[PDB]
Ligand binder design. Structure first.
Ligand SMILES: Nc1ncnc2c1ncn2[C@@H]1O[C@H](COP(=O)(O)OP(=O)(O)OP(=O)(O)O)[C@@H](O)[C@H]1O
Ligand SMILES: Nc1ncnc2c1ncn2[C@@H]1O[C@H](COP(=O)(O)OP(=O)(O)OP(=O)(O)O)[C@@H](O)[C@H]1O
Ligand SMILES: [Mg+2]
Ligand SMILES: [Mg+2]
Lengths: 240, 47, 242, 38
């Protein structure tokens, strides 16, 4: 199955959750490819890829090279495809390249058809670019990552989500009446809300600084157990 | 309310607003108080 | 002066800080215009604008109308220019309109020259669109909003910031070991960090749900006092023109 | 870095960071931080 993960807004935890979910699925015995579709190219740093390593599928594609040679094997069950490092000029002119990347769609479609991987997880950025839409269209299912706050609340009444997406809460914390109020309202009103959530957890803040997925970094972290609940739900509901 | 067309692999991607149901908010008193505390929440639920 | 505020990443507090800083500046006697340059059109909700009110400078402009009729008065010293509500089709086709908004620049440059406002604050989205770059070029100064975490740490080593931007920490709370490590490292190494920060404060989480800027919602909140310290710093250091 | 109709330009550069010279414990704790500091 191809699973897209996309924040309803930036900064909600999409990339850390993608890396953690890939690790969880592997621990459950699955073969996983994790693809970074974000021009920020941050997913690779959860898998101990050197910051100075500039290769990636989009970097290769823009350079006229074979994107399939930019993949990395993290474990026997977990493969990674970084986006690649853009120059500042590329970063500040996405219109120059965001329509030159269509080849990735046919390449991932071929990978899908081969059955090489049991799961392909795609970390999708919070934009509406041509390449983001193209990658979404390849997904069998998608998760929309939120935090329980007034900003995400508003966004859920005005921005479209991929059809069939389910909503996953991250960063749930103690000490917030307004969060608790929004959450109780969501429980009665938000038809697409998943029944499990992820708390704000120091392991999820530390694991990127340690350059590992959360469940490798701290296998008994409460957040690692919450991600496993998500993984088990995905196996049951998102498999095909 | 939008369908993206991906001709390069012959796929479509539909988008729509999230599915939200406010029909049964009045029944829980815990939600009635929260709606009174926060006008932003009341605004969406009244509609 | 025109002051741009832009997050280094999405979700770091940029819009709440823009609304709060505008409130603080107008509390200090300044006439302020706050402009929402973000297509998500969220800033207006900090000023009790009805969600169903769709008008805005970009809405009007895309509809062949005068952006100057989309302004709103919050107080006698605080005006608001919402972006306007885009359809789902417009949201998912940003290339259609991101290149058709450049006339806002001469309109704001003319509004600047008139001296009607001592401050024009622009809430800038976390993107690199043509219109974002255009509005950024009108700013005399800019703030880059961060949270203290590993993601923002990485971004400060790989993405460009507008030349001359200062970095403003938001959502700070002591007690996280990794966050305290990053923060102490930034103190010794980030040469453009501002001397004040904004703590995590439930007033900043609540004020949007109350549809008010933080200083109006809870004037004695720590975050409101910190935003006032920021406003005083801006009067001192950012009042010059570019 | 990068430099962006009307007579206005906007320069872009990476943030000014100085790793010239307590924090040694922070760098040993987190390989990500040690990575940028070397
Ligand atoms: N549950 C959590 N508890 C604590 N820290 C968290 C949690 N989830 C994420 N973080 C931290 O928050 C920061 C942002 O996380 P992440 O990079 O996953 O977000 P994102 O939505 O992918 O951001 P971006 O908009 O940059 O793509 C990181 O420093 C991460 O370590
Ligand atoms: N200092 C703070 N303390 C507590 N909560 C905060 C603080 N700053 C912001 N928040 C909360 O974080 C959420 C996001 O804030 P805001 O909308 O200002 O961020 P943003 O960076 O403008 O987001 P976006 O990328 O969608 O434009 C809001 O619900 C806000 O109430
Ligand atoms: Mg991310
Ligand atoms: Mg904002």
């Amino acid at each position: 199955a191809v699973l897209g993960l996309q924040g309803v807004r930036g900064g909600v935890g999409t990339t850390t959750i993608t890396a953690a979910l890939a690790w969880s699925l592997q621990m459950l015995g699955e073969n996983v490819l994790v693809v970074d579709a974000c021009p920020d190219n941050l997913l690779r740093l959860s898998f101990n890829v050197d910051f100075t390593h500039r290769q990636g599928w989009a970097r290769a594609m823009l350079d006229g090279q074979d994107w399939r040679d930019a993949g990395l094997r993290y474990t026997s069950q977990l493969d990674l495809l970084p986006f690649g490092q853009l120059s500042i000029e590329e970063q500040e002119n996405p219109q120059h390249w965001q329509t030159r990347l269509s080849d990735i769609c046919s390449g991932l479609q071929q990978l899908k058809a081969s059955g090489r991987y049991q799961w392909i997880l795609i970390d999708l950025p919070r934009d509406a670019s041509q390449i983001t839409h193209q990658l979404l269209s390849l997904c069998d299912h998608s998760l929309a990552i939120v935090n329980v706050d007034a900003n995400c609340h508003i966004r859920l009444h005005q921005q479209a989500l991929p059809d069939g997406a389910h909503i996953l809460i991250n960063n749930f914390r103690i000490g917030s009446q307004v969060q608790d109020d929004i959450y109780q309202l969501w429980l009665q009103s938000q038809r697409r809300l998943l029944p499990m959530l992820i708390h704000r957890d120091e392991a999820m803040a530390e694991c990127l600084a340690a350059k590992q997925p959360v469940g490798e970094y701290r296998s008994d972290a409460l957040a690692a157990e919450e991600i496993l609940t998500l993984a088990n739900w995905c196996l049951l509901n998102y498999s095909g | 309310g939008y369908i993206f067309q991906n001709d390069i692999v012959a796929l479509k991607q539909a988008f729509s607003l999230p599915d939200i149901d406010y029909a049964d908010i009045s029944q829980r008193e815990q939600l009635a108080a929260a709606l009174k505390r926060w006008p932003l929440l009341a605004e969406f639920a009244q509609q």
